[PDB]
RNA sequence: GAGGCAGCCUGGUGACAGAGCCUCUGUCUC
């Protein structure tokens, strides 16, 4: 659904890097440079953003029960 | 009137046919759900070839 | 052939077969033939030219599509017995001029050889590097992996659904996984897997998991249980109603809790429910003044009511569904899989302190035994951990499509070297308990794992004089009924060979269906016995004075009465 | 009710061959996609003849070689190759 | 359902002794220490510190099972030196090392902040 | 027969990490030190949640799970809070908990990101690390969706739950050129040299030292933010000293009963 | 119970004599009615005869204090108007 | 009475014992049970 | 048969050992007298094994021959393998 | 009908008399625990609280049973019922008044299953009497059953989600049978073949082989770690094999403390060469490939499956014969707990490094295949020229097919032995093939060298198309590529045709598994 | 070999090829209760009824069905209280 | 689309769905 707060392996916060990561990709960075610019050095953290799927962008198409 | 035929979802006779992704989300349908099955008494049913 | 390629008179789905030795030409317009598209080859050249790819690139806004490729006469549908008559190149490499000529008269070309695989076999990386039984085991295990199953899962009141908190797309992906929409709806997580013999809890096919990853939500999921219920009017003067029951009106009232119900006789969502809590109060009028039909939350669960919805069914009676959710934090005994038939239960969980760590401080998420690899020869599992370590460092998702001559384990090793890792993926680990280096350098990499539908708290069961069947008076059947386990024929066969005759009469009698009958001494048929009058009789003999008591299984008394109903006289003689 | 009953039960006749019309599997999206592409041979599961269960050469490119169930169903229940198309028929006129 | 509460890894229940001392009858001047609610963190440093004492003939630790949180430490010493004294000494030596290491880290901090 | 006398160098120091070297200590002590960095340094993290409304696409314990993982600034008051086991009050009080609040409704026509910036606290000492560096996304709300909840943070350590582990990583290394042969390379020429390697390009290992033991331990303690990275290390040394002096007291009481 | 406990040392098979069926049966006039119930309660000589066993989960039977569990059930008979082959 | 929310127009309407379920203002036939008001406490774990 | 011309072996079989201990344990639980000086034991099945190894269990084993005859052997008369 | 109630399976006799559902039984998934004795089982604390044993009240135990009554069913240590002399049972689940907590001699208290209760433990299909053995209960956290890994060998169990049935005996008289007849230690040796049914296996066996090399030297602190796990140890540290310049013990020297009593045994290690017993060094074995145990002490030789496996006359067989069950229980338990704790120092792994060979070896493999394929072309040229003549009693086609099968069986085994000779002594496939813990020399050949010929019903892949194997080949092509010779390793990866032919061969194994699993109880029933 | 032998003995001790088929068993001298547990449960008992056959209750399946100690292993002997040795 | 037995029977457990007024079907697990 939504980006994990922590990297599962080591406890590094990545829940504040997802919107920045997409912004860096909008700036035509590679995923490599974008992960570097965010300070994701360990591959255990790089796999958190590189492999996340933001399905919450699909759950928010459906209108809520209460308007 | 002679009877009812159960209709295969997203077939050309379905109400979901030809809708775009924006429309299906209004119906609370999934745009990625493939259809190709029937609903009988609320159960989804597949005709295995 | 010309007319079918032009689509003029002959629909492209018509198949046409000359059988040159038989001097038969056959044509089939019949339905239900299976066929597949193949590229046409003429004079040792593909008819597909570079211009077709350019037009197909513009498909985002240009009208050109697959239809125009078929209509151009560039691809052909060919069926299972026109294939008897074609020569297929496997790739346009086969068309090249070669020093030794195998065939010079190809007629068609395979599009991509990997399109022989199906759905669940195309989520497998490097399947050309696996023993084929293991590709089959995944194609069955893939269907059991949790993920997100459909996007509109919040409105659906499906009786069972499992949705994973944090599914990821694989770091290592077959190109066909695009068309499966596995990126959009993934069913697994990339996990740091150490192939190491650690404390031994990953022996056989068990697996060790990082407890600190599990605390951070690794493979955490929620389980949705949906209960339907239906009101009715029956005949002229019986009704069911949803209502709050009460012990001054309803016969069947339990000592359990009804105060979670509202005045409509339903719970409301957000309430915390446990086994034997009433989730719907339902009553039926009794000719006490009502019987109780209330539904109970299915035992051994604990959860919270996620949704309650109320409607009219096909007949216009009040009709209701309740959905309950509970979260399933993975335990030992939960079953996991690797996309390569490496199924296995979690054997123990070690906190981040105790897991073996690299110089960088990386612990693994999962440790699997190396003994799972040599006999099974899942070499595709090893190459994924290598390609995934290159991909997580390069910041890429790695092309694991089968039959891809452009990729090699040597080439992946070279690329891994450039990031400052040993080219074969080994890494020096340190023991978490003592800090000493481990003498072997463990193979570590990121590998896509799956959590399967099978969980121990679904399966844990015990029996101790629970409910009893009506006819046999033996224990009920199955976990859902609090049923007893079947001590079968082969079990008694062993207890005979063990000579455990007293256990065998315990387990197979006094711990199942103990009973007593009185029996006439003069004929072996059951006597009437008024235990509280102290009087006994054999109608049949007028014996009133010499009658035995006989312990026997209830299913054995039942047999003898069921034999007597066929007029057989199984006379039990005590003497 | 005649069309509805066999779709509701799977019994393909007037109350027959069972096991048409399974419930659509909704465990995971790959399950659903596989279920809608499954094929079944009606041969009885109790016989021990292997020949109908073997992977024939003509399944190449038509039916998935890797995917088949465990147990007594082995090799009879099958699944389509991703580009396999089943004809729908025309009149020969 | 059967999950052990996580605080039960380090909180004693009412009437658990933190330590228990039993003489090992197999061999002389040997003793067995049972440490409740501790793990490899506290076992391995006390073993290592005991192994430095030249009057300690045997020191070792195990956790009997990973799912229940206790250590057993076995200590054997020369005669005229009890394993109770060897164990109490090893603790005071570790307290001295850790306070001395702490003071030197505080200094190195200031030297790195203010320079 | 007595204590080692260890020495320290600090080679890097930031808000994010420390690199330091300890020399002349046991591998056993060097390891138990990195163990305490992970799991027995206490911090404050959210442990109790009551949700008063939730209309988002995440269920109530999905949001409460994420609240637990948000790193709270702990540096100053963790030493002053009791553990909730110790305080004599019924339920909570300011002696043992920090009260949090979060009310958000999406009335605007476009997706409101709910974040750690929206968590609001009874005191200034305790704010989310990203406010003390973009904020951690709690949930995304659609128009008309809502989330309001009350929470409490409590003192604990990473043995209880990984939310109380203060470190984003702990490097640990010794003998960076393999002089002790505590690992054995089947082809030593194929291994990248450590950061701390002291070899030329062509020599692949230090020659064997039969006399040696582990003597020089290289650390890199990275904080998640709840503690400054050097105050993690000082809390570990003070805590591990406290653990041993708890033993020594209870051991002395038992000797005064064996005897 | 008053009776002596015994093991079963032999089983003798055979056929029930039709006179022994008459002697054994508690349905002293045979079954006569297809119906189960009189005025809702069970019909004697019908297919729920209260001498033929305990009917209800807390009831009794007319022939012995049957306690539902303790009563083995008792045999009845239908007198066939004409002999018929046993298949 | 209870208050249920229409599945089609998201409005509340009050509804009551033996009253058929239909939605005023749009005629739709599926209702949702609102959400509870008593407190439930979560560990943030 | 008398205590003479016994043809069965003097060893107590594992099956006899199993049932003798099971029976005597049940007797001790039913507050039978104990034929040995117990030493802090309280489990009747451990007391039974102590009485067996002492040869003190007051039981006679009746061994049926397939001709229908039988031999009586006191438990003290039988050799124990274990 | 009445007959249909009786007809057979699920009918009264077979379905409810020759086998039936039973009270006091439990089922759950099994998981490993190397910290258990072979005679122990780890039981979920919920299961132990749900299942009770009726214990008779006596002056020896009434003081204890009063407490378990006074705790009652909400505690785990407690009881579910009291049974009076009348058989009237007080249910303790719902708080009874003090009149109903009274206890007197001859009452039965349904106390909960405790540590040290005896249970039968079973896995279906129950193919032999070793598939039901007595275990002693240890209560553990979590919901799975735990069994020691040696005990997985009798049951044919593995931890990929298998489930097992616990049966709790309900009287002292049948408690004693299981103890005296059926306990795991009494089951170590099977009458089927007088072999032992339990061996050492998996990690412990690969570590046993590695631990017992001459190279394995242990320092004082490591030895004092391993000796902490010996339950049998006497407390005397042995004098080290090397005293100067540094005290070092050897793996053999600590294993000699695991071996019980004064066992005398001789074996060979799996790599022992043929010459070594005939030339010089009949003793003082160069490779340490000859095992000799004397007086309970391992003097020389590498231990492996030939020595601690389930075969006859193994070191663990002779332990049972010379020492009995009570001591051989401890032998299995000690081998695992010390040598699994040593593997915390060695570790073990397999990776991509172990499945790769030198560029020398790959050229030897490729040149072998290139000749073999050209030889098959020569045999075809003979057949097509009508120069081939039949073998006696055989068809010409049978002659041709045997000759082609000859050439390609040579190639598979020539490349396979080339690959195995190419393996460095560090290789981790070799470390399992040589210990015998898993895998085999053909697996190494397939992973490293050549997967080989794929067979359908014992023949080269059939012409399922008209005179050809697939649409890709021309007709009448009998060559190795055409008919299913997979000339690539799993590391090299299969070509598309090879991948399909390898699925055709793999399917036959899946069919035969289903057929043979469809029969497991059939013959055994008729025989019994 | 002592298991291979015991099968070959049992298959031949009655003087003919005792095939272990339904009628190959149902020509044994075994009682009606044991025969009904194999292959033809009711038909076996019809012929037992029509011919007035008897079962001596001396097989294992026989005593199992009636819930009595089987004539096997721990059951194949009997125990008597040594009321004289109870003196000591 | 296969046996075998005198129309029926095709090896042990297991867990869930669907259909019907407990019985039947299908899928799945070792
Ligand atoms: Mg298994
Ligand atoms: Zn990380
Ligand atoms: Zn009579
Ligand atoms: Zn009666
Ligand atoms: Zn509405």
Numbering used by the authors:
A (entry chain J): 1 to 67
B (entry chain B): 148 to 196
C (entry chain B): 588 to 874, 887 to 1174
D (entry chain B): 442 to 456, 462 to 539
E (entry chain K): 1 to 115
F (entry chain C): 2 to 133, 145 to 271
G (entry chain A): 11 to 97
H (entry chain L): 14 to 58
List sentences quoted exactly from the publication behind this structure.
RNA polymerase II (Pol II) is the 12-subunit eukaryotic enzyme that generates messenger RNA and is thus a focal point for the regulation of transcription. Transcription by RNA polymerase II (Pol II) can be repressed by noncoding RNA, including the human RNA Alu. Here we present cryogenic-electron microscopy structures of Pol II bound to Alu RNA, which reveal that Alu RNA mimics how DNA and RNA bind to Pol II during transcription elongation. Biochemical analysis revealed that Alu RNA binds directly to two molecules Pol II via independent interactions with the two halves of Alu RNA, Alu-left arm (Alu-LA, also known as scAlu) and Alu-right arm (Alu-RA)2.
To that end, we prepared a minimal version of Alu-RA containing the structured elements previously shown to be sufficient for both Pol II binding and repression. Three-dimensional (3D) classification revealed two minimal Alu-RA conformations. The first RNA conformation could be resolved to an intermediate resolution of approximately 5–8 Å, and corresponded to an Alu-RA–RNA-like conformation. The alternative conformation even more closely mimicked EC nucleic acids. Thus, stable binding of mammalian Pol II to structured RNA likely involves contacts similar to those formed within an EC. We conclude that loosely base paired regions within Alu RNAs are important not as a mimic of open promoter DNA, but speculate that it allows the RNA the flexibility to adopt a conformation matching that of the EC DNA–RNA hybrid and downstream DNA.
